[PDB]
């Protein structure tokens, strides 16, 4: 699995303070300056030391500590009033302003949730106020504690090895030794998410691609109001069949016809060998046609992928309900002394494996939509077809568990898991 850790806010504070003190000792700088450097360089100590040896002036400028190199005032530039010399503060940029206006500036910014990003009051000036400068300018303790909380938030966000738990009101931090776009789960609120973008787990797609896909699903006119079909007419009977299970292999109870929920085409074409339902039938010479036909083809392709994305989500939901009913039936058998949980554990294992596999499959479709043509896309489409075929086989067998024995169900489990593993090892990239 992915090697991650769940730390409390106290442990995270301790780790961050250790890093700060080490860097402040090494660089012969104050703690606030060291924090500024660490935040600007995402707490990557190696790059910080390398660039400090390369150009210390450029490092202090980029970290917003010193102004770019390329007699008092007694007049604050924002309140226009004359003030005392001691009540006239400034950063290294020497932009001087009076103490009352500094207090007002910091108080407003902190009240608006700003932590690290408090900057000089002069336009364009990139300098950022260090902690030891802001803290005396905050009068009350709730303001100082708000500032500390926002600073800790910004520190965990900027730290390349740490991420705040997206769970609502969850005071946990997820730590990772080598940050990648992989699945993590907080052990206090059970929130699952991708480590890189802090959104829903989305393998094999990367973070940018899935963000684009979600925005397109929500914004495009043809999909913003989309509702998946609850019922469909049997290709043989025309009877209104309802989709209650997650398995897309439907058998009409009236005529015994086996068809596919996405196609309305017969199921004997949807075996593991020669699985075609998941590939988009692309047009090769449609780049050489009119803009009308090109836009129509773009709509066709987008809908082909989006409908399967949506239907696999719906199937995940329906299969979760099926798993709940299975759990209830095993509970009933156990209390009736018809067996024990160990003898039906294979069924719940199959259900969890099916959920995992169909999650992966659901996310394979944005990946296939945003892929460019070529042999890599053909390889991905073959692996995706194998995954989908074995997934629908496993879901059929899980929905009808009393008609199948332990052996073939575990075999289908292993087959679907192997297909999912192959897809992930080939296409879950950096
Ligand atoms: Zn002023
Ligand atoms: Zn300034
Ligand atoms: Zn959590
Ligand atoms: Zn991500
Ligand atoms: Zn029928
Ligand atoms: Zn199909």
Numbering used by the authors: 58 to 127, 134 to 493
Cite, word for word, the article reporting this structure:
In the best-characterized E3-E3 pathways, ARIH-family RING-between-RING (RBR) E3s ligate ubiquitin to substrates of neddylated cullin-RING E3s. The E3 ARIH2 has been implicated in ubiquitylation of substrates of neddylated CUL5-RBX2-based E3s, including APOBEC3-family substrates of the host E3 hijacked by HIV-1 virion infectivity factor (Vif). Structures of ARIH2 alone and bound to neddylated CRL5Vif-CBFβ reveal the HIV-1 hijacked E3-E3 ligase assembly that overcomes host restriction and defines mechanisms by which NEDD8-linked CUL5-RBX2 activates ARIH2.
The two ARIH2 molecules in the asymmetric unit superimpose with 0.6 Å root mean square deviation (r.m.s.d.), hence only one is described. The canonical RBR E3 catalytic elements (RING1, RTI helix, in-between RING (IBR) and Rcat domains) are interspersed with the ARIH-specific UBA-like (UBAL) and Ariadne domains in a two-part arrangement. The arrangement of the RING1, RTI helix and IBR domains in autoinhibited ARIH2 resembles that in activated ARIH1 bound to UBE2L3~UB. ARIH2’s UBAL domain stabilizes the E2~UB-binding platform on the opposite side, by intercalating between the RING1 and IBR domains, and packing against the RTI helix.Fig. 1 a, ARIH2 schematic color-coded by domains. The Ariadne domain is an elongated four-helix bundle. A groove between the first and third helices of the Ariadne domain secures the catalytic cysteine loop from the Rcat domain. In particular, Ariadne domain residues Leu381, Glu382 and Glu455, respectively, contact the beginning, middle and end of the Rcat domain catalytic cysteine loop. The second crucial portion of ARIH2 is its N-terminal region, which is not present in the crystal structure.
